[PDB]
Design an enzyme around this catalytic site. Structure first.
Site, PDB file in Angstrom:
ATOM      1  CG  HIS B 243      -2.198  -1.059  -2.372  1.00 26.25           C
ATOM      2  ND1 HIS B 243      -3.112  -0.948  -1.346  1.00 26.25           N
ATOM      3  CD2 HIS B 243      -2.293   0.090  -3.083  1.00 26.25           C
ATOM      4  CE1 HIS B 243      -3.735   0.214  -1.435  1.00 26.25           C
ATOM      5  NE2 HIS B 243      -3.256   0.863  -2.480  1.00 26.25           N
ATOM      6  CD  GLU B 296       4.005   6.763  -4.758  1.00 24.26           C
ATOM      7  OE1 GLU B 296       3.684   7.407  -5.779  1.00 24.26           O
ATOM      8  OE2 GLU B 296       3.270   6.673  -3.751  1.00 24.26           O
TER       9      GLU B 296
END
Lengths: 371, 365
Positions: B243, B296
């Site tokens: 996303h 991340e």
């Protein structure tokens, strides 16, 4: 850009959740746990372990179990810190997985397992390191969780004192959306383990502005006890510009139901401070209402919470921990509801600070040493 | 009605601005690209976010051997910080001034970094002598020396660049938790301890250690394009991609990827190949939504470059986020407003206890 607020700080009045756990019907003057009035539970002597199951599960039949032998590892000098750090440390040794990776039965079992350990830690922390622990065989002959707590702490407790704790712990088990319950639901909404949520809730509970901690009415009750007249002591406190502890603006529509059941327990169990406490309550209400007739004055439940706790030999510095012990029912019920709801609580914030700016045009850039 | 407080405005901050539509992240108006490019150490970025200006950076940590050994680095600091209040005499936030709260936040911050380094080093190893830690000139080099003894200087620049990019990112659950506790007047050590609890949640964002198995598959496979297909064919989620967060590229991932290349991370080329292969796959299979690389992903590459194991990366994320937490806690104190929402009852109406399921299995005392 040019983002501008409009007569807007905080979430006051903002509805964040819907709940089936409990209803503090303040306009109606009643407090109900899953539709069960708080006065019927206390007057029919329902133990805290059973009310814990009622708030979490929604029905009776699966109360708290006896706490497993786990000597307290944290001796910081603060009972709150001892239980806050202690509960966070349960996850690695007990293998607590995040909330996202476990089913509901495991989370409910992990909440019940951590709640009784918090009660045990508070009992050990108050007993102190300067006392040998109570033997397990003596704790084992207790039949209720409340009696188990008093035995682990006092050794040979008066059954009347055990009955008093069950009245207080039930009346303070859950009371809607507060800062400590909100913290528990926010941490749990991130999928973290239930030990982390209970640990963070204890930290939020320690705040002075949280409210609900037993009031500092013991020194005042010590004066009326030996001076005799309650009307003269209360009048002297107000005439000297001091504050009456345990009395103020209304919380419910009229008398707080939790304050009514705690006062009823102090009379029923024969608390030595009861007769003075009634005279102080009658004099405080009459004097405060007479001086300001257009302001609503009611007795805080902290007033009778202090009397009931002191009757059970609970020191004043241990009374906030007694409140945290009972609130574990509400925290656990709200953590399980947040787990089933399954959505992260993440609000937004509008930036009103400085605009784009180079590092060299900031105060003290000459103090900065570059690598 | 929709629960979750999504879109609900709670505060007006001056600390930092995550410009989503602009694709930039600024700390007090200063872009994180300039701070990383001009090599501003984490101790000074802490002062910039908390105080609003440079000058009073983070001090060296005092000698305090870690008292908590739980096996989880997150638990060691969550419990460790909460125990600082009685030993250091941390009064509630309601009863202290601003300059005292700021010093208490700076003191507990460098102690939280010291606790992570000791916990990661482990109890099965002698501690690094204090005279070696005294040789460092920045807080970040102090962290690596207490942890590794003889750390590589390039790994210090990697952590220093990562900590700056993760120092603050608006009203997230961990930052929201710190403000909620601070609004009650609790001491700063309890607000930080609660923020670490909400931080360890997997649904909070910033789980870099989970991408490591994917990069390990590509090392022995040889072609990252077919490996990304294999993960998606079996039906499990692709790690580190998906996303869109900002308008397009995340500014923190832009800084972390540039830091991985300039410092010569050995696993850079495979990560760039995995990033290209993963982006082309999700954009082909789902061409109707914008797909970007999550921060991340490159945060794991940068942290893995500095020898940070998988079960320590979450604690490194809390280390840098202490700047954002302390800055919002100090702002929450000056605001002086207890934050609490409300809830509507939708449960059952008034009923007797005898009508509840299981009343027969209850014993009256």
């Amino acid at each position: 850009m040019t983002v501008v607020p409009e007569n807007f700080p905080g979430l006051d009045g903002v509805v964040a959740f819907t709940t089936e756990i409990a209803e503090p019907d303040k306009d109606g003057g009643a407090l109900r746990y899953r539709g069960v009035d708080i006065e019927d539970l206390v007057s029919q002597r329902v133990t805290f372990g059973d009310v814990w199951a009622l708030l979490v599960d929604g029905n009776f039949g699966s109360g708290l179990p006896p706490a497993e032998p786990f000597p307290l590892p944290i001796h910081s000098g603060d009972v709150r810190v001892d239980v806050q750090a202690g509960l966070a440390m349960l996850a690695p040794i007990w293998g607590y997985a995040p909330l996202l990776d476990i089913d509901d039965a495991t989370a409910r079992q992990q909440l019940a397992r951590a709640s009784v350990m918090a009660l045990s830690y508070v009992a050990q922390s108050a007993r102190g390191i300067y006392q040998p622990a109570v033997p397990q065989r003596i704790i084992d002959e207790c039949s209720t969780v409340t009696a188990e707590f008093m035995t682990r702490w006092q050794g040979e407790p008066d059954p009347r004192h055990i009955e008093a704790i069950d009245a207080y712990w039930v009346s303070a088990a859950e009371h809607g959306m507060n800062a400590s319950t909100f913290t528990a639901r926010v941490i749990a909404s991130t999928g973290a383990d239930v030990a982390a949520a209970l640990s963070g809730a204890i930290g939020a509970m320690s705040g002075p502005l949280h409210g609900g901690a037993p009031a500092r009415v013991l020194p005042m009750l010590d004066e009326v006890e030996r001076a005799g007249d309650a009307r003269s002591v209360v009048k002297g406190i107000l005439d000297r510009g001091e504050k009456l502890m345990g009395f103020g603006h209304r919380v419910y529509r009229a008398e707080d139901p939790r304050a009514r059941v705690l006062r009823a327990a102090a009379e029923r169990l024969g608390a030595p401070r009861y007769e003075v406490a009634v005279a102080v309550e009658q004099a405080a209400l009459s004097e405060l209402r007479e001086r300001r007739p257009d302001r609503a004055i009611e007795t805080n439940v902290e007033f009778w919470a202090a009397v009931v706790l002191d009757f059970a030999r609970v020191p004043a510095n241990m009374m906030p921990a007694m409140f945290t012990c009972g609130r574990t029912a509400g925290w656990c019920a709200h953590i399980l509801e947040q787990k089933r709801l399954g959505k992260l609580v993440r609000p937004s914030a509008i930036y009103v600070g400085p605009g784009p700016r180079s590092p060299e045009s900031v105060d003290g850039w000459e103090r900065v040493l570059t690598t």
